[PDB]
């Protein structure tokens, strides 16, 4: 039976993990390759490298990171942040990324989803969706959670499946970084609309929150803050989830 | 006495992931070399991997154009280990619904059919139960099609969405793995080490 996945998201800037971490056991805690290896070692199921960098030098630095990571990592990883066209997505997948995560450029050109899927398969395409309640409606936001597109979440989720996406990374802009819990209402809202796997994102602060996301229908739960500051231990979390009936990958 | 491992590198898909996983599995061995194989102009390897991610038809096409089909057969006939990974495992059989009318390597009797789930591909970590030799646990999968073979050739089984299918197969010294051990963290490394050991010890 398929495992419900625990995913770590690493914010990277200029080929380095932003802030560094609290893992003084590492030789370098801002090195994406060493940190990804550490997460594989402790039981993380997949990695997302999110490039929040703002250089003019950004395409090359992301390519350097994918090549560095693909050299040493032994679990699947997704790269995202500023992937604006097929050409950028292609170089990243060819350099070794298992998936690319696209958001703003997918909204502004939905055929980009199909373009990537047609060359690399639907499994290489993650569409990141940032959503927010506006006047009692779930709306899609682009430009780092910033621009209300006027597009309804239910319309976009369906369109994203038709265009050939392999997976949805669903972030509630209200919960991002608050450690208050995932937006389980939004997850429940999206679950019957699509048969695609849903990655819950934004708000995780405690072990109970990962359980809530799976009860709400997510196939995976992603977190950044709670891992970066070492507030939740991956193995303890997986043990907690298994005692509560969740099928997780927990090896001896 | 040195051990030569070959990895067919014509594709489709990212074959360098398996190359790096195999040399990771090889670090504690000395005198083990790993080579990328794109032509039959080589001496036979002790252990030959057939990787790939893509369409069954494109997998066979690239094996055909680079004159590797008889090279693979020479390994089977000389009782060297041949290991298919992911698409490479499917190429071991006779045909697939993914590529109607395309002939596979036909090294193991059976065929390849679409999984039954309403959600395809089968993608994520799923449990593999082995009859022997390899470690039970969760490996990483990404595939839409599955093998159908006789029970004697089933080496490991996995259940996805109610359907039990062969996630690993064995016929003599031909092995196939439907998952990606090079993307399966610690247990994938122990599986690849065990494959190397199987060919070092007969
Ligand atoms: N930190 C940033 O400055 C930033 N900049 C851009 N992003 C997002 O990345 C994506 C950019 O994609 P493109 O439009 O470039 O394709 C969009 O989702 C942006 O909103 C950013 N988001 C970062 N972290 C978010 O918060 C979640 C973690 O939550 P936590 O467990 O509670 O800590 C992550 O999954 C992300 O959704
Ligand atoms: N993802 C893959 O390409 C695996 C091999 C084959 N195309 C399948 O879907 O089963």
Numbering used by the authors:
A (entry chain A): 1 to 252
B (entry chain B): -1 to 200
Give the text the authors published on this PDB structure.
The imidazole glycerol phosphate synthase from Thermotoga maritima forms a heterodimeric bienzyme complex consisting of the two subunits HisF and HisH (HisFH). The HisFH complex catalyzes the synthesis of the histidine precursor imidazole glycerol phosphate (ImGP) and the purine precursor 5-aminoimidazole-4-carboxamide ribonucleotide (AICAR) from N′-[(5′-phosphoribulosyl) formimino]-5-aminoimidazole-4-carboxamide ribonucleotide (PrFAR) and glutamine (Gln)9,10. The ammonia then migrates over 25 Å from the HisH active site through a central tunnel across the beta-strand barrel of HisF to the HisF cyclase active site at the opposite face of the barrel.
In order to visualize the structural changes that take place upon formation of the active conformation, we determined the crystal structure of HisFH in the presence of ProFAR and Gln. Two of the complexes (chains A/B and C/D) adopt a conformation highly similar to previously published apo structures of the HisFH complex. In contrast, the third HisFH complex (chains E/F) in our crystal shows electron density for both ligands and large, long range conformational changes that extend between both active sites. In the closed state fL1 forms a short beta sheet and several highly conserved residues in the loop make extensive contacts with ProFAR and the HisF active site residues: fK19 forms a salt bridge with fD176 and the phosphate of ProFAR, the aromatic side chain of fF23 forms a π-stacking interaction with the imidazole ring of ProFAR and fN22 forms hydrogen bonds to the backbone carbonyls of fI173/fD174/fD176. This can, e.g., be visualized through the angle between the Cα atoms of fF120, hW123, and hG52 which is reduced from 25° in the inactive conformation to 10° in the active conformation. As a result, the amide group of the substrate Gln in the active site rotates into the newly formed oxyanion hole and forms hydrogen bonds with hV51/hL85 (through its amide carbonyl group) and hH178/hV140 (through its amide NH2 group).
